Structure formats: C-alpha cells, structure tokens
C-alpha cells in the first residue's frame, strides 16, 4: 500500500522544488534534465502502482463479478488519471522551456506567474486524484 | 442552499490553522478532516501558499478561474472537490497574509455558485453529498 505512495511522494517532492521557481530552478528549466527526471519518477510511480493493483488481484478473493467488470475498470481508469496528471506536470514545464526559448533565454514574470498558476492547479489535482484512489484502494481490499 | 453553508464553515475553519479567524453537520466535519488529510500530503513535501502567485484584488478572480478550470479540466471526483475547497482556503489565508480580506467573501461566493451551477450536477449523480460522507466517513 505505502510504496506507490512513496514513489508518488518522490514525484511531488521534486515538483515541490520546481514550484519554488528559484534562480536555480529557472536555470534548470532551460535544460531537459528536469523534465527527464519527472518522467522517471512518474514511470516509477506508475510501475509501483501497476504492480500493486496486481498484488491486490491475488489476495482479493471475494470476487463479486457482475460489478467487478465495473470495479477494476473504475480503478484502472482512476490510475489512468494519476499518470495523466504527472504527464501534464511534465508538459507544463516543456511549454515553459519552449516559451523562454522564443525569448532568447529570457523569462518574463507574466510567464512565471502563469506557470505557477498551472503548477498549483496540478499539485492540487494530483493530490486529489491520489486521494480518490487510496480510498478506492480500500474498497478494493476491504 | 447546502453549498453556501458548506463553504462558510470550511473557510471559517481554514482561518484557525493560520492563527486567524473571521466571519447534517457530519458533512462539514468529514470535509474538514478530508482537507486535513489532503493538506498534510500537501504541506508534507511541499510548502504552503509558498508555491504562490502574484495575488492582487484584481487578479484574484483570474487566478481563481485559471486554477479551478485546470482542476476540473478532465472530469470531477470527490478528491478534486476537496482540492477545490483546499484551494479556496489557500486563497483566503494568502489574502490576510498579503493584506486583503473582503476578498474572502468574494472567494466564498466564488465557490458556492460554482458548486451550485457547474458542480451540483455531478454531485447528485454519484450519490449526493451524503455519498461523500459514506466514502470518507468511518475512515
């Protein structure tokens, strides 16, 4: 239970440092090392998550099946949203990069306030999507 | 009807945690705890209204709209409405920390109607508000 959550906590913790938008971060954001790192922590989060739904499908033994072609389908889509949020976080920082590249490495505050807007929206939706899951990973298991 | 009250007490409560306070109760309680579980995943490996934006009295309606759109861009679930409540709270405590507060009443009327108009429809489909307490209650 608490391992795909830890991989997620490593994605969020790194994103947390990118949300600081420090001089350090902005210099980093003009390279491909921050978006490459985000994909790793995401492809780890999804790996630990995909291997954990399988881990439940083993000890999950009650198997009421008229509604379980609805159950797992609701959760196979509710993990589809988590990988979606983490892909979006990565893309929002690809757009920031391509935007400052058209400004010759420069970066306005109108852009950084706009990026901070999207990062906050994503952090919230990320946590909330992971909440709608961890609860739905206790109706599965219980 | 309901949603006006739910916002009132949730904003009420979000002042307390920042050394502040200004102007079926199992719903209000469960939502209060949900926002706490939610927020100590937030401020756990994050920081507060620290990942902030440039918030003036004139841009607050714009940042509220930008964030709330992207929050529900691709569907609605209960975990995101908690974020919507958490975000609305993050608005109000950034206000008094940045020297605004009648904004809070605006933010308060920027959450109610949005539940009333564009969220009320999804609420009754997945079981109404009493469905939220049934899924987040005895947990």
> Which residue ranges make up each domain of chain B?
1-139
Instruction: Map residue B43 onto helix, strand or coil.
Output: coil
Q: Which chain A residue's Cα is nearest to B39?
A: A127
Per the CB < 8 A criterion, the answer to whether B84 and B130 are in contact is no
Closest by alpha carbon to B104, among B23, B39, B18, B2? B23
Our CA-based measurement puts residue A57 at a distance from the nearest CA of chain B, in whole angstroms, of 21
Closest by alpha carbon to B49, among B92, B96, B89, B90? B90
Q: Is B41 on the interface with A (CB under 8 A)?
A: yes
The contacts of residue B124 (CB under 8 Å, 6+ apart) are none
Q: Which chain B residue's Cα is nearest to A118?
A: B67
The contacts of residue A128 (CB under 8 Å, 6+ apart) are B38, B71, B77, B79, B80, B81, B82, B83
B41 backbone φψ class: left, alpha, beta (φ>0; ψ -120 to 50): alpha
CATH number, position A112: 1.20.120.20
Question: How many angstroms separate the CA atoms of A118 and A27, rounded?
Answer: 19
* Alpha-carbon distances of B31 from A19, B40, B134, rounded to whole Å: 27, 14, 12
- Alpha carbon of residue B22 to chain centroid: 16
Q: Is B93 on the interface with A (CB under 8 A)?
A: no
Alpha helices for B17-128 (secondary structure H): 26-42, 60-71, 78-97, 102-108, 112-114, 120-125
- Token representation of residue A102: 């058209």
Closest by alpha carbon to A1, among A134, A132, A140, A130? A134
Closest by alpha carbon to A11, among B46, B80, B40, B77? B46
Could you tell me the residue range of the domain that residue A82 belongs to? 1-142
Q: Which chain B residue's Cα is nearest to A15?
A: B46
Test the B interface: residue of A120, A123, A129, A130 with most B CBs within 10 Å = A120
Interface of A with B (CB under 8 A): 9, 12-13, 16, 19-20, 78, 81, 84, 109, 113-114, 116-125, 127-133, 135, 138-139
Question: How many angstroms separate the CA atoms of A130 and B103, rounded?
Answer: 30
Q: Please name the method used to determine this structure.
A: X-ray
The contacts of residue A21 (CB under 8 Å, 6+ apart) are A112, A115, A116
Per the CB < 8 A criterion, the answer to whether B65 and B112 are in contact is no
- Token representation of residue A15: 């994103």
The contacts of residue B18 (CB under 8 Å, 6+ apart) are B93, B96, B97
Q: Widest CA span of chain B, in angstroms?
A: 42
Per the CB < 8 A criterion, the answer to whether B25 and A106 are in contact is no
**Number of domains chain A contains:** 1
The contacts of residue B136 (CB under 8 Å, 6+ apart) are A135, B30, B33, B34, B78
Resolution, rounded to a tenth of an Å? Answer: 2.5
Question: How many angstroms separate the CA atoms of A86 and A104, rounded?
Answer: 28
C-beta atoms surrounding A102 within 10 Å: 7
Closest partner residue to A127 (CB to CB) among B42, B47, B78 is B42
| Burial classification of residue A50, based on how many CB atoms lie within 10 Å of its CB (0-12 exposed, 13-18 middle, 19 or more buried) | middle
């Amino acid at each position: 239970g608490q391992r795909w959550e830890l991989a997620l906590g490593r994605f969020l913790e790194y994103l947390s440092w990118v949300s600081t938008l420090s001089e350090q971060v902005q210099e980093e954001l003009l390279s491909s090392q921050v978006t490459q790192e985000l994909r790793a922590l995401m492809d780890e989060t999804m790996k630990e998550l995909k291997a954990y739904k399988s881990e439940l499908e083993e000890q999950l033994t009650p198997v009421a099946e008229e509604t379980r072609a609805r159950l797992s389908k609701e959760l196979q889509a509710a993990q589809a949203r988590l990988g979606a949020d983490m892909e979006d976080v990565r893309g929002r920082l690809v757009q920031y990069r391509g935007e400052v590249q058209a400004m010759l490495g420069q970066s306005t505050e109108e852009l950084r306030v706009r990026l901070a807007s999207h990062l906050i929206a994503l952090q919230l939706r990320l946590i909330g999507d992971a909440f709608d899951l961890q609860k739905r990973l206790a109706v599965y298991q219980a | 009807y309901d949603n006006r009250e739910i916002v009132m007490k949730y904003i009420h409560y979000k002042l307390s945690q920042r050394g502040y306070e200004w102007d079926s109760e199992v719903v209000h309680l469960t939502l209060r705890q949900a926002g706490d579980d939610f927020s100590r995943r937030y401020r756990r490996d994050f920081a507060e209204m620290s990942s902030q934006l440039h918030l003036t009295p004139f841009t607050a309606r714009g940042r509220f709209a930008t964030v709330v759109e992207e929050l529900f861009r691709d569907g609605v679930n209960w975990g995101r409405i908690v974020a919507f409540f958490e975000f609305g709270g993050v608005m109000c405590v950034e206000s008094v920390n940045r020297e605004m507060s009648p904004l809070v009443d605006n933010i308060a009327l920027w959450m109610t109607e949005y539940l009333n108009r564009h969220l009320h429809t999804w609420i009754q489909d997945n079981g109404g508000w009493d469905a939220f307490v049934e899924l987040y209650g005895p947990s």
